[PDB]
Design a protein around this nucleic acid. Structure first.
Ligand SMILES: [Mg+2]
Ligand SMILES: [Mg+2]
Ligand SMILES: [Mg+2]
Ligand SMILES: [Mg+2]
Ligand SMILES: [Mg+2]
Ligand SMILES: [Mg+2]
Ligand SMILES: [Mg+2]
Ligand SMILES: [Mg+2]
Ligand SMILES: [Mg+2]
Ligand SMILES: [Mg+2]
Ligand SMILES: [Mg+2]
Ligand SMILES: [Mg+2]
Ligand SMILES: [Mg+2]
Ligand SMILES: [Mg+2]
Ligand SMILES: [Mg+2]
Ligand SMILES: [Mg+2]
Ligand SMILES: [Mg+2]
Ligand SMILES: [Mg+2]
Ligand SMILES: [Mg+2]
Ligand SMILES: [Mg+2]
Ligand SMILES: [Mg+2]
Ligand SMILES: [Mg+2]
Ligand SMILES: [Mg+2]
Ligand SMILES: [Mg+2]
Ligand SMILES: [Mg+2]
Ligand SMILES: [Mg+2]
Ligand SMILES: [Mg+2]
Ligand SMILES: [Mg+2]
Ligand SMILES: [Mg+2]
Ligand SMILES: [Mg+2]
Ligand SMILES: [Mg+2]
Ligand SMILES: [Mg+2]
Ligand SMILES: [Mg+2]
Ligand SMILES: [Mg+2]
Ligand SMILES: [Mg+2]
Ligand SMILES: [Mg+2]
Ligand SMILES: [Mg+2]
Ligand SMILES: [Mg+2]
Ligand SMILES: [Mg+2]
Ligand SMILES: [Mg+2]
Ligand SMILES: [Mg+2]
Ligand SMILES: [Mg+2]
Ligand SMILES: [Mg+2]
Ligand SMILES: [Mg+2]
Ligand SMILES: [Mg+2]
Ligand SMILES: [Mg+2]
Ligand SMILES: [Mg+2]
Ligand SMILES: [Mg+2]
Ligand SMILES: [Mg+2]
Ligand SMILES: [Mg+2]
Ligand SMILES: [Mg+2]
Ligand SMILES: [Mg+2]
Ligand SMILES: [Mg+2]
Ligand SMILES: [Mg+2]
Ligand SMILES: [Mg+2]
Ligand SMILES: [Mg+2]
Ligand SMILES: [Mg+2]
Ligand SMILES: [Mg+2]
Ligand SMILES: [Mg+2]
Ligand SMILES: [Mg+2]
Ligand SMILES: [Mg+2]
Ligand SMILES: [Mg+2]
Ligand SMILES: [Mg+2]
Ligand SMILES: [Mg+2]
Ligand SMILES: [Mg+2]
Ligand SMILES: [Mg+2]
Ligand SMILES: [Mg+2]
Ligand SMILES: [Mg+2]
Ligand SMILES: [Mg+2]
Ligand SMILES: [Mg+2]
Ligand SMILES: [Mg+2]
Ligand SMILES: [Mg+2]
Lengths: 115, 202, 100, 112, 50
RNA sequence: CCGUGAGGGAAAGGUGAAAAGAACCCCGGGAGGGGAGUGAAAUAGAGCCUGAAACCGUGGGCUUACAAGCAGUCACGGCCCCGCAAGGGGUUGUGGCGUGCCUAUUGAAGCAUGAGCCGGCGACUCACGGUCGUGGGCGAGCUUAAGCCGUUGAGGCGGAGG
RNA sequence: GGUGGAGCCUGGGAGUGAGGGCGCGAGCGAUAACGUCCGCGUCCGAGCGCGGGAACAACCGAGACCGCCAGCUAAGGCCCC
RNA sequence: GGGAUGACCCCAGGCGGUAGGGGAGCGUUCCCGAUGCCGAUGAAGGCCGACCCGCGAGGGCGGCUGGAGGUAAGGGAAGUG
């Protein structure tokens, strides 16, 4: 018997071109450009999920390192006065502390200045 | 397997037989595989670049036209050119050990017989073949066409009687084959037949 | 009032009455959970130490989810190497009820 | 209620005739009538024909009351192109395509 | 024992022959043949036994 | 159709059950269309089954004229949409990051090959031998070939020979 | 001592038989070459995946199974970018 | 190890990767299954989906289109991506 292409290749190509909706130019409308574009959207996403963690931590820090200088010390020391006081609670994600709850920050600067 | 319900018009009586006790589904499958292979028509063909109806001529020159490079148009790379490793006529038959055929026969019965599904009969009297007649003797023998039957008899008249039933498949005894047994839900023979079936296996 | 609690190696800010999605933990649904042991009060001065003991947060186990599918992809140019793997990530949900 | 006319297989280039179609879109039928007469393009002829048939079709078929007609929407899609051979220098022979437009004027009633 | 159950033992199926089809399966592009030269060429090498 | 000639050598199938293949009227020179009518269906209307993709076009939502780029990806935000909301879809302002695919090479984003885009065609096979492995039959044995008989696609015989 | 994607035996399938940089040891060269030919190592090849080196296969850091808006480090860094 | 002779819980490890070796799967045409089953209360094909199953190849489901075919479980053979 003979099995020719028929319906298969159209469905494979169709699967891709859905994935590319929204891209510029042929990269949305051409199977080939769409594929090529995707390959790279693949590795880019991966890479940036790794570095989504890196990105956020820095923003946490800068906000932290910001609020301390208000209370008269820097980040680099603040961590020590906190690594000492045992207070490893801060988990820089909660610099949501520093913004929303200032007096909770201040009291933390205190157990921090006493090292 | 062993205890087999004969029908002679006088008695309801049973018969004990032969018939290997354990079965080997691979062995069975291997004989079926054979049977359906050796009956393959072997009929598909296609044309090589060699057999196609075009010419030997070189399409373009091969340097300096700036198109790609080419032989005859019969070349498989061309639309409507030769086929590459597509079908030619061949014969799909091969020879099973005779000894496997024989085993697999004896086995396929037994599988049926240890289901109880095997029935031996004598003489019918749903003979004189008219499907209407056979259909009587059958309903007497408890065959209501509620499962497929493979009828084995040397009687030409009882055969044609049964033939047109959707649920009945008919055979002379030398026709006994494991394929036809396995596709049929139960088995039916007379005491010729069954005797030549013995005289066949072993 | 609020706590700062620790689950699945991460630390969240909880109100009582808050539905919050958390790394998948071993429990039946509907059961109660005592959340070790947290780190802060919202009436302040208690912070201290790694973990202030005797406080706890009680959230009830709502159910066990699986997040939206991430398609993780790996391509390597000129070497003929591609890999597709779908990954959707188990998680549980809980409702913060009261703070110790 | 709204009414249309479609001129099909007009032998003229879609790109060329589209231009005058743009001139009269959303125009009251009366300004559209004046614009094409004094437009100088081979396609002002062909559009004016479709304009009218739709104007005819409007009053005459769908009972639309002529005086309030405007051009609701309108456009030319591209029909099947006839190809011809244009012989060239050194034996060469390109093919030029004389094209085809499907002109569509769609009329609706002003609300005044 | 019905046709629907027939089927073979775990080997002797064996089938699943080889390939020049996609990446992923290896068996792709150069197709087991390895890049190269006279062996990769169609009518192959010269008969190794001699 | 190409070739002086031998010779080369294509494309191109499908309305509907039934022509009932659209009388008549309207714009029109016509072509084409709009009503009418047929029909289960007329975006089945004869350039007629299904009617993909490239490609062209009209309408809408979000957007863009002090930014700079393999065009994506991560994040937040604005607008529009679906809703039970903690929700989801669209789009994209600013901010992070970011050297196309294939091939060939010690090395390519490479200013090295190939590719305008889409659809379809397109390359590890079969025969007989050989050799390993594997699933089974029989085991000091195993096994038949040509052929003969028989056959709803029924098998058996055949021991020359290996 | 050493249980290791260690070793040895028999057998089935291979691909490779253009290498390249760097450190160290020589020869050739001019105590030239991103030179050339050997030796021992390494790395790129195949890790043009990740961090550092402004950028940069092979130098420093380090061997990426998947996910997180958690932590600690490496080389390298902490005036602003 | 859990003794369930296992398809399964627990614990511990391994899993960059080109030429290549190995293994498991998805899908396409065709045959047995089939004198059956699905089907005009709508087959194959097409267009959508933010939904469900699968690691992935894929399979579902739903709506629209389409209008006469399709073909499970299990297995067989190839002009199979
Ligand atoms: Mg093909
Ligand atoms: Mg990190
Ligand atoms: Mg020829
Ligand atoms: Mg010749
Ligand atoms: Mg050229
Ligand atoms: Mg042909
Ligand atoms: Mg041809
Ligand atoms: Mg033809
Ligand atoms: Mg690259
Ligand atoms: Mg390379
Ligand atoms: Mg000229
Ligand atoms: Mg001339
Ligand atoms: Mg052109
Ligand atoms: Mg294959
Ligand atoms: Mg490989
Ligand atoms: Mg392999
Ligand atoms: Mg090989
Ligand atoms: Mg090659
Ligand atoms: Mg070479
Ligand atoms: Mg050769
Ligand atoms: Mg002539
Ligand atoms: Mg017809
Ligand atoms: Mg009509
Ligand atoms: Mg339609
Ligand atoms: Mg139709
Ligand atoms: Mg057409
Ligand atoms: Mg039809
Ligand atoms: Mg049509
Ligand atoms: Mg637009
Ligand atoms: Mg300026
Ligand atoms: Mg601006
Ligand atoms: Mg950006
Ligand atoms: Mg190339
Ligand atoms: Mg080259
Ligand atoms: Mg070269
Ligand atoms: Mg070179
Ligand atoms: Mg360039
Ligand atoms: Mg060049
Ligand atoms: Mg190039
Ligand atoms: Mg193509
Ligand atoms: Mg062989
Ligand atoms: Mg062999
Ligand atoms: Mg044996
Ligand atoms: Mg005969
Ligand atoms: Mg080894
Ligand atoms: Mg070996
Ligand atoms: Mg050599
Ligand atoms: Mg050499
Ligand atoms: Mg060397
Ligand atoms: Mg080396
Ligand atoms: Mg040197
Ligand atoms: Mg050198
Ligand atoms: Mg050299
Ligand atoms: Mg050398
Ligand atoms: Mg070296
Ligand atoms: Mg190489
Ligand atoms: Mg390496
Ligand atoms: Mg590079
Ligand atoms: Mg760098
Ligand atoms: Mg590197
Ligand atoms: Mg690893
Ligand atoms: Mg340091
Ligand atoms: Mg610096
Ligand atoms: Mg593990
Ligand atoms: Mg691997
Ligand atoms: Mg490895
Ligand atoms: Mg109907
Ligand atoms: Mg089909
Ligand atoms: Mg459908
Ligand atoms: Mg079927
Ligand atoms: Mg199957
Ligand atoms: Mg093919």
């Amino acid at each position: 018997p003979r099995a020719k292409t028929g319906v298969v290749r159209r469905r494979k190509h169709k699967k891709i071109l859905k994935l590319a909706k929204g891209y510029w130019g042929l990269r949305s409308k051409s199977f080939r450009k769409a594929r090529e574009t995707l390959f790279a959207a693949g590795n880019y996403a991966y890479a940036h999920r790794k570095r989504r963690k890196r990105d956020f931590r820095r923003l946490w820090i800068v906000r932290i390192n910001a609020a301390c200088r208000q209370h008269g010390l820097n980040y680099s020391t603040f961590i020590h006065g906190l690594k000492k006081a045992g207070i490893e609670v801060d988990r820089k994600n909660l610099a949501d502390l520093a913004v929303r709850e200032p007096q909770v920050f201040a009291e933390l600067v205190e157990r921090a200045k006493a090292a | 397997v062993y205890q087999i319900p004969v029908l002679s018009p006088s008695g309801r009586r049973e018969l004990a037989a032969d018939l290997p006790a354990e079965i080997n589904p691979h062995l069975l499958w291997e004989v079926v595989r054979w049977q359906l292979a050796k009956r393959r028509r072997g009929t598909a063909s296609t044309k090589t670049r060699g057999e196609v109806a075009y010419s030997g001529r070189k399409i373009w020159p091969q340097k300096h036209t700036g198109r790609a490079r080419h032989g005859d148009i019969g070349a498989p790379i061309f639309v409507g050119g030769g086929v590459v490793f597509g079908p030619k006529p061949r014969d799909y038959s091969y020879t099973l050990p005779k000894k496997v055929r024989k085993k697999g026969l004896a086995m396929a019965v037994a599988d049926r017989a240890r289901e109880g599904k095997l029935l031996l009969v004598e003489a019918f009297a749903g003979v004189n073949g008219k499907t209407k007649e056979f259909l009587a003797w059958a309903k007497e023998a408890g065959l209501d066409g509620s499962e497929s039957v493979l009828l084995v008899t040397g009687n030409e008249l009882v055969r044609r009687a049964a033939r047109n039933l959707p649920w009945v498949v008919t055979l002379a005894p030398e026709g006994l084959n494991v394929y036809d047994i396995v596709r049929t839900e139960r088995l039916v023979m007379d005491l010729d037949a069954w005797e030549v079936f013995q005289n066949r296996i072993g | 009032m609020f706590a700062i609690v620790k689950t699945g190696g991460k630390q969240y800010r909880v109100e009582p009455g808050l539905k919050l999605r958390v790394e998948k933990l071993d429990a039946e649904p509907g059961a109660t959970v005592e959340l070790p042991v947290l780190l802060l009060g919202g009436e302040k001065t208690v912070v201290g130490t790694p973990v202030v003991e005797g406080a706890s947060v009680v959230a009830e186990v709502l159910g066990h989810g699986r997040g939206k599918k991430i398609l993780v992809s790996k391509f390597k140019a000129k070497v003929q190497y591609r890999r597709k793997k779908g990954h959707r990530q188990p998680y549980t949900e809980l409702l913060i009820k009261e703070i110790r | 209620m709204e009414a249309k006319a479609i001129a099909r297989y007009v032998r003229i280039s879609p790109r060329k005739v589209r231009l005058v179609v743009d001139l009269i879109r959303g125009k009251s039928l009366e300004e559209a009538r004046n614009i094409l007469r004094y437009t100088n393009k081979r396609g002002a002829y062909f559009v004016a024909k479709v304009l009218e048939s739709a104007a005819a079709n409007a009053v005459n078929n769908h009972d639309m009351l002529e005086d309030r007609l405007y051009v609701k929407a309108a456009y030319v899609d591209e029909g099947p192109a006839l190809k011809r051979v244009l012989p060239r220098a050194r034996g060469r022979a390109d093919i030029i395509k004389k094209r085809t437009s499907h002109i569509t004027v769609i009329l609706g009633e002003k609300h005044g | 024992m019905k046709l629907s159950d027939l089927r073979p033992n775990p080997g002797a199926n064996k089938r699943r022959k080889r390939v020049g089809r996609g990446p992923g399966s290896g068996h792709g592009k150069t197709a087991t043949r390895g890049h190269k030269g006279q062996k990769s060429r169609s009518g192959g090498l010269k008969d190794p036994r001699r």
